[PDB]
Structure formats: structure tokens, C-alpha cells
Design an enzyme around this catalytic site. Structure first.
Site, PDB file in Angstrom:
ATOM      1  N   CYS A   1       0.799  -1.227   0.000  1.00 44.38           N
ATOM      2  CA  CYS A   1       0.000   0.000   0.000  1.00 44.38           C
ATOM      3  C   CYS A   1       0.851   1.306   0.000  1.00 44.38           C
ATOM      4  CB  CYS A   1      -0.972   0.032   1.189  1.00 44.38           C
ATOM      5  SG  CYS A   1      -2.137   1.442   1.166  1.00 44.38           S
TER       6      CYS A   1
ATOM      7  N   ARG B   1      -0.040   4.761   2.787  1.00 43.70           N
ATOM      8  CA  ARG B   1       0.061   4.553   4.228  1.00 43.70           C
ATOM      9  C   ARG B   1       0.391   5.805   5.026  1.00 43.70           C
ATOM     10  NH1 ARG B   1       4.030  -0.327   4.782  1.00 43.70           N
ATOM     11  NH2 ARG B   1       4.373  -0.020   2.549  1.00 43.70           N
TER      12      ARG B   1
ATOM     13  N   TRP C   1      -9.456   5.878  -0.858  1.00 45.86           N
ATOM     14  CA  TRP C   1      -9.786   6.520  -2.125  1.00 45.86           C
ATOM     15  C   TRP C   1      -8.775   6.036  -3.138  1.00 45.86           C
ATOM     16  CZ3 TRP C   1      -8.758   9.723   2.327  1.00 45.86           C
ATOM     17  CH2 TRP C   1      -7.454  10.225   2.427  1.00 45.86           C
TER      18      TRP C   1
ATOM     19  N   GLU D   1      -4.752   3.381 -10.872  1.00 47.46           N
ATOM     20  CA  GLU D   1      -5.476   2.117 -10.663  1.00 47.46           C
ATOM     21  C   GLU D   1      -6.615   1.959 -11.655  1.00 47.46           C
ATOM     22  OE1 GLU D   1      -6.105   0.993  -6.355  1.00 47.46           O
ATOM     23  OE2 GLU D   1      -5.745   3.171  -6.135  1.00 47.46           O
TER      24      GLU D   1
END
Ligand code: HEM
Ligand code: HEM
Ligand code: 1Q6
Ligand code: 1Q6
Ligand code: H4B
Ligand code: H4B
Ligand code: ZN
Lengths: 405, 403
Positions: free
Chosen positions: B107, B110, B279, B284
Site C-alpha cells: 500500500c 500509508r 480513495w 489504478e
């Protein structure tokens, strides 16, 4: 079922298992507790003999004479030679095979579909820095071939007990100068500041441009390195223009045709070739994305974006991405116009996929370093992004080695 | 040994010491690195993971060693000895869920790890109840475009019984309908879940952007089908700031990325249904979901609308089109006032996060292949940053599909 790493391609849904990795004789940096795959550089008679036997076994298998009498006679020859001298020497065809196998083994190279096609110049007779220079010019002439580039390697004499090494000090045969300025900045390629300063300390008269070709510092055993200027006619460069943005040529950007790595060690059967420069042709992203747009290299993204009139004050205009694309396109267009070999990141990665499939059938795997194989622009638009890869070290190999100074 | 971690843009070097707290093996060995792979190939144990986690918690609030700390360890111990398991306090759950996010190597978001709304849904006994909780999560996380990170945690796994599970991979997904001629209409990644919904009674639509119903499963029961009310599901129509034909493609995407198939592990307890959301980062959607060859695969259509020379890779037609689609996604989210972050701002903030975590914990587990974005990699600072991957607990883990 299979007790070998399972390898998946997520675009196609296909699965392979890598069995080749079981031939790795040598640990990388990873352990069950932590993966170090993304680090660029993480850190003797019977020992030599077993490396040598393995290599001789590879050579005999490669010519389908494994177990033959010529094979058992070579093994004996090699042990006899180590027994009496501490080292041994390769037959010409052994060197050729070992060199090719080192390229084929290189996890960080996406060009390996071409691995079988490598001109090997044997320079194991070389006895002076001046002779290194001739060999090198011959290499550059051969490899450059007026724009129609040919892959090649020149092999200088191996490391020898007690005696000093053959070394080329420059990291590549062709590199641009990097001159540290009084305002702390750099003119030229900041990657080459140290070697630049070394050339000047060894008597080079430095220029003052952004694209000054460096001279070579060549070191023969137990001598100080000597300095050699390449005749400019030997060093092919491409001025960069862009196919529609007419102002792009006004920037005076350019790159050299020949990418020729000169500071790596070619290890074959435990023998160490400390000077063995090798060359191919460029993939476009090396020039147009890394060498021209890295912040610690020529760092031209902002200037190009300003010329394109982009909103450089906010990340979300995607001004970096747009400028970088146009620079890559200029690199491809200009190399094409000049008829100098180049490959784009799409065609290169497609060809690397074909390579992986060739190597699956031939050896049961291919060591590959995913971070280095996936291009630095447009990653997931290339098929290698969606392909899992297993990274491990096989010999023969090209290995990093400490700088001679 | 403590690995040396270098940034190649800046010349700077750290030492990751935090990796020593890993108790949990990854896929790599000294003979071969498997870091580019997507998936991996009793009471005393639970008790030690429990103790370790309770320690992390009491240290996090500075009360390490206090009465409260000792009495809590003894409660955990008394419970395990008698029942083979134990339960977390709400405050512990909140801490553990934030830590699981913090610890997630894949991720890039973070920096936000401390700002996480946690709904405790451990008092849930039915798929119907799960649905209500999920609707509340969506409503809260969406907040009319001003997206807020959240997790809802359903009841833990228990030895005696089936798990609570949400069958769908995310709470919001588009259907993919296989055509008799091989092709897929919609999102090819959701063909299986789409078919599962159909067989459990859903009347399918036939668009490229049909929002799926949820299959929720309470223990040892067939899963149940729930249609999300369409007003709960914020979508963003895609347009391009300068290319007017782009809106004519009829593309769109949902605002809320909410993963619902992963397992949350805290102190040895396992939460098989624990959907979490933040979000999106524009790549992506713009790069992977719209341009992957095995996703909506639109690169070619866009290139043709841009009149690009498609017949040769060396026009960089793909690259040019990918950039405009990402631009359209950022523009359209901005216009609709729905939260989004581009890959430059996101990776800059991750660099800041690395630096915060170096000071706070002596390291940060990160998976370089997943942190570096799928376009313009080397244009982002994370490309030039070496990273160490390892598993810390609390953690989010993959788990098998329930069917
Ligand atoms: C024929 C065309 C070739 C292409 C397009 C090519 C392409 C590349 C690329 C893109 C890289 C990564 C470079 C970087 O990012 O710094 C690379 C690395 C490498 N290639 Fe090639 N390659 C070619 C030929 C060769 C040849 C002839 C050899 C050796 C005989 C070779 C050995 C290597 C090695 C050792 C590396 C790793 C360098 C390092 O770790 O710093 N390649 N290749
Ligand atoms: C607030 C904004 C957030 C952003 C921008 C963000 C960004 C991302 C991105 C880009 C990925 C890669 C996703 C992919 O390629 O499939 C990812 C993965 C992930 N993030 Fe986040 N994240 C956010 C919040 C969260 C939150 C709230 C959680 C959990 C509480 C979380 C946990 C994860 C996990 C577990 C993964 C790995 C998924 C996997 O392995 O498939 N993130 N994040
Ligand atoms: C920091 C640094 C280390 C190191 N070993 N080498 C350099 C510069 O060498 C050039 C680079 C090495 N990765 O290689 C580029 C290359 C080589 C070859 C043979 C082909 C090609 N297309 N591209 C910089
Ligand atoms: C194959 C697959 C596995 C899995 N666990 N999830 C999916 C679908 O979810 C995609 C992805 C997780 N990999 O979610 C993206 C995401 C999640 C979150 C919390 C934030 C964000 N920006 N992006 C597919
Ligand atoms: C930290 C990271 O490993 C480093 O920046 C790598 C990533 N991938 C790369 N890939 C290639 N081909 N060349 C490089 O110099 C690098 N650099
Ligand atoms: C094989 C490879 O690891 C796989 O394609 C990964 C690469 N990096 C990724 N990174 C993110 N963020 N999401 C992904 O799905 C992937 N896919
Ligand atoms: Zn690894």
C-alpha cells in the site's frame, strides 16, 4: 504438485515452474524473513576446481558430448593444470560459449533473445595499455558498423595470482563528461563526475560542454592507468529531434549509439576476466527516460515541459508523463532517421516474452529481475509487467566489481 | 544482519532494523528471489501472538508495564487456557486495524494510516445484518465525494464453524458477462463472481458498467444476494479536459475502492470479513482497470479516436493514449469533487511516510513492484528508492475463495 517455484502470467493466466533455479550454486541477498530483491548492490584450489568442472560440464553438455572421452580428458587436463599452476586456461570455443552463457544468464538484461548472437573477440594476448586501446577501437568499429549495430565482447587476459589486473576504469566505453560547477551544480552527465575528475587528474584537458565524450583510462597489470582519446570519427552520436515539435532540435540534445559496459567482471568456470567490455544496442527508454529525465542525470523534464507549455506547477496535469513520452519519441525518431539501431520498450519486452518461452523449453526457466526488466515508463502497458519472475545467480556471469581506485 | 537501504536519486542510506520483528516467513530464500510473485504458493502459538499484540497495544498508549497491562495479559491467558481462544477489546481492535494497514507492504497510501474509521460489527449474526453494516460503511466512507477511510470488522473465525465472508472481491464491482463468442462484456476480472450472483438468483443486466449485487455469507449457510441501492454507489462519468469525443466513449468508474475478500489478523485472531476502503490513485483506474489487456482493454479505441498510428509500437501510441486516459480520470474525479490522488502526489507522500517510519520504527515493509506505479515509474521518487519487504502482524492477508 511440482516442488519448484510456480510462475504465473497474470495477463494470460498461464503457469510454469522454474527447475533451472536448482542449478544455482550461489546465494543472492534474500531470506525467508525479508526480500531484498529491490536492492541494486547488496553485498583457492578445490573451490576453483569445482567451479571449473561445473563449467566444463556445461560446455560438454552444450555440444552433446557429455560423458565422452574428450570430456573426461578435458576434466583431467583442467585438474592437472590447477594442480601444478593454481589456475587454468580456457580453449577458444570454451571462452565463446562461456561469454554467451554469461549474457544468457544476466537477470537484469531484457535483450537476451539476442544471446546466441555475440561476436566474441579473444584479446587474451593483450600485454599493454596501448594494445587494449587498439582492441577497444576495433571493438567499437566492429560493433558500431556505421549504425547497423552488432553485439560484441572483447576479452582481455584473466586475473592471475600475484600479478595486477587488466582494468578499464570507465564504466562504459562511451560516456559524457560531467563537470562540477562553482554553484555546486553539474554540466554534462552528473553520473560521470568522478571519472571525469579522474581523467583530469591523469592529465586530460577537459572541455566544457554538456556532451563531451570522455577519454579512456586503461590499466594494464601493475601499471598506473594511461589515458586514450577516442578518435571522434569512431564515436557515433545521434542529434535528437522530434517528429512534429520543431523546437525540440533547438535543445541540442544528443546521445551516443553504442552502449558498451566496461567495468564488469566476466566470470567463467571460476576464472575472472576483470576487463571484458561488451556492447549491444539501446532500448529507447534507457536514453529518453533514465539518462535524460532522471533527476540525478540530465534532468530535462521541466525544460521540455515548459517548451510544450504544460502546467508544471501541479502534479495532476501529468506534465511529467507527457514530456517524458515526447522525449522517448524523439529518441526513437532520431535514431530511426539516422539509421542507427534502437529498440522501443514495447518491442523489446515482447521479444523478452518470447525469450522466456524459448528458455522455458530449453532449460526450464530463466532468471530475471522484474524491477530491471519492466521499463521505467509505461510499465503495465508492456507484457513483462504481468509476468512473474524468479531471480537467481547462474555461472558464467557478469558480476559487479569494485572500482580499481 | 540489518540490510542497508539506499535511495539512488539522493545518495542517502538507512538501515532497516524493523525487519527483525518479522515472525512470519515470506516466499524468498538465499537460492532464489520470489518477490515478484503476487500470491504465496494450537494454544501456546495463539497465546504468544496474543501476548505480543497486547504488548504492542500497551506500548502504543505508553502504559507498558502498568497494572492494566498485566491484568489484560492475564485475562487473555485465562481465556485461552479455558476456551482455546479470546476476544479483543474495541480499543485494541481499533489499534490492530490501523497497525494492519500501516504494515501492509503493497500500500502506497500509508501516510494516511492513523486516520481510519473503524466500525465494530462483531455483534452481527446474519447476512442481513452484514448488509446493513455494509450500507452504513459505504454511506460513511463515500461522504458525498469527500471520501474517508474506513474498515468494518465482522466476527472473527471460530474453530467450531464456518466463516463470515463477503464473496465479492470489493464491495463495488462491475459485472462481466461472458459472450458465447468468447469476448467479455464488462469487467473480465468479475466474470466468475457475476456468474455466481446469477446462479444465486440475480437478474443480470447487459451493460459494460453494471454494479454487482453482494453475496454475503453467515456461517455454514448458503450466501445471500443483496442489491446495493444505486444512490449508495457514487460513480464518476469520464470525460477529458480537451478531447470532446472522450465522453462519447461512455466510460465511468466508481468512487469507492473497498476490498472485501482479505483476512485481517490481529493477535492471532482472524477476521475473515473485514472490508476496508480509502480513495483511489488515478493509475489504478486509468492504467490498470481501463487499459490492462485482460481488463476493459481500451487503449486501442482511444488511440484510434486520437488518430494515432497504431500499426507500429515505435509511435508510442499506447503510451500517448494511456496518458490521456489517466488525465481524463483525474479531471473527471476533480470535476465531480470526488477524492482522488495522482501517482506523483501519492508517491511523494509515500516517501514522506518512509521517512516518518524510519524515525518511528526503524524501517518500513514495502513491496517495490506494487509501490512503483504502472506508468511513468522512474518519474516517481519511489522508483529510485530501495525497499525491504517482510511481514509484520497485525496484517491483512489473502484467504481462499469460499466456494
Ligand atoms: C542487443 C541489445 C541489447 C539490449 C537492448 C539490452 C538491453 C538491456 C537493458 C535495457 C538493460 C538494463 C540497463 C540499465 O537500466 O542500466 C541491460 C542490462 C544488461 N545487459 Fe543487456 N541488452 C543488450 C545486449 C547485451 C549484451 C551484448 C550483453 C552482454 C554480452 C548484455 C548484458 C547486460 C547486463 C550484464 C546487464 C546488466 C547491467 C547492470 O547490472 O548494471 N546485454 N540490457
Ligand atoms: C486512503 C487512500 C488509499 C490509497 C490512495 C491507497 C493506495 C493503494 C494502492 C494504489 C494499492 C495497490 C492496489 C492494487 O494495485 O490493486 C493499495 C493496496 C493496498 N492497500 Fe491501500 N490505499 C489507501 C487506503 C488503504 C486503506 C484504508 C487500507 C486498509 C485499511 C489499505 C490497505 C491496502 C492493502 C491491504 C493493499 C494490498 C491489496 C492487495 O495485496 O491486493 N489501503 N493501496
Ligand atoms: C551506477 C552504475 C553502475 C554500473 N554497473 N553501470 C553504470 C553504467 O553502465 C551502463 C548500464 C549498466 N546498467 O548498461 C546499459 C546497457 C548495456 C548494454 C550492453 C546494452 C544496453 N542496451 N544497455 C552505472
Ligand atoms: C485478484 C484480486 C485480489 C484482491 N484481494 N482484490 C482484488 C480487487 O481489489 C483490487 C485492489 C486490491 N488488490 O484494490 C485497490 C485499492 C484498495 C484500497 C483500499 C485503496 C485503493 N486506492 N485501491 C482482486
Ligand atoms: C531502487 C531500484 O532498485 C533502482 O532504482 C532500480 C530499479 N529498476 C531499474 N531497472 C533498470 N533497468 N535499471 C536501473 O538502473 C534500475 N534501477
Ligand atoms: C507479476 C507482477 O508482480 C504483477 O503484475 C504485479 C506488479 N505490480 C503491481 N502493482 C500494483 N500496485 N498492483 C498490481 O496488481 C501489480 N501487479
Ligand atoms: Zn526476494
Amino acid at each position: 504438485g511440482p516442488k519448484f517455484p510456480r510462475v504465473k502470467n497474470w495477463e494470460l493466466g498461464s503457469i510454469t515452474y522454474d527447475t533451472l533455479c536448482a542449478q544455482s550454486q550461489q546465494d543472492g541477498p534474500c531470506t525467508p524473513r525479508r526480500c531484498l530483491g529491490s536492492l541494486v548492490l547488496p553485498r583457492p584450489a578445490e573451490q576453483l576446481l569445482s567451479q571449473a568442472r561445473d563449467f566444463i560440464n556445461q560446455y560438454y553438455s552444450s555440444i552433446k558430448r557429455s560423458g565422452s572421452q574428450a570430456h573426461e580428458e578435458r576434466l583431467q587436463e583442467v585438474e592437472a593444470e590447477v594442480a601444478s599452476t593454481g589456475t587454468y586456461h580456457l580453449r577458444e570455443s570454451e571462452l565463446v560459449f562461456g561469454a554467451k552463457q554469461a549474457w544468457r544468464n544476466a537477470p537484469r538484461c531484457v535483450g537476451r533473445i539476442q544471446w546466441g548472437k555475440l561476436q566474441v573477440f579473444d584479446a587474451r594476448d593483450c600485454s599493454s595499455a596501448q594494445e587494449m586501446f587498439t582492441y577497444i577501437c576495433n571493438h567499437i568499429k566492429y560493433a558500431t558498423n556505421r549504425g547497423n549495430l552488432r553485439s560484441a565482447i572483447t576479452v582481455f587476459p584473466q586475473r592471475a595470482p600475484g600479478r595486477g589486473d587488466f582494468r578499464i576504469w570507465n564504466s562504459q566505453l562511451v560516456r559524457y563528461a560531467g563537470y562540477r560547477q562553482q554553484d555546486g551544480s553539474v554540466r554534462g552527465d552528473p553520473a560521470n563526475v568522478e571519472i571525469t575528475e579522474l581523467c583530469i587528474q591523469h592529465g586530460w584537458t577537459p572541455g566544457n560542454g554538456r556532451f563531451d565524450v570522455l577519454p579512456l583510462l586503461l590499466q594494464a597489470p601493475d601499471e598506473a592507468p594511461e589515458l586514450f582519446v577516442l578518435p571522434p570519427e569512431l564515436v557515433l552520436e545521434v542529434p535528437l529531434e522530434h517528429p512534429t515539435l520543431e523546437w525540440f532540435a533547438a535543445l541540442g540534445l544528443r546521445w551516443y549509439a553504442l552502449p558498451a559496459v566496461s567495468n564488469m567482471l566476466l566470470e567463467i568456470g571460476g576464472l575472472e576476466f576483470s576487463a571484458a567490455p561488451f556492447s549491444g544496442w539501446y532500448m529507447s527508454t534507457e536514453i529518453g527516460t533514465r539518462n535524460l529525465c532522471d533527476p540525478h542525470r540530465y534532468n530535462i523534464l521541466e525544460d521540455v515541459a515548459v517548451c510544450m507549455d504544460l502546467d508544471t506547477r501541479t502534479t495532476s496535469s501529468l506534465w511529467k508523463d507527457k514530456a517524458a513520452v515526447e522525449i522517448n519519441l524523439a529518441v526513437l525518431h532520431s535514431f530511426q532517421l539516422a539509421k542507427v539501431t534502437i529498440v522501443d520498450h514495447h518491442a523489446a519486452t515482447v521479444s523478452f516474452m518470447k525469450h522466456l518461452d524459448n528458455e522455458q523449453k530449453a532449460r526450464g526457466g530463466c532468471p530475471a529481475d522484474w524491477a530491471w526488466i519492466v521499463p521505467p515508463i509505461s510499465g503495465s502497458l508492456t507484457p513483462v509487467f504481468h509476468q512473474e519472475m524468479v531471480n537467481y545467480i547462474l555461472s558464467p556471469a557478469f558480476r559487479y566489481q569494485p572500482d580499481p581506485w
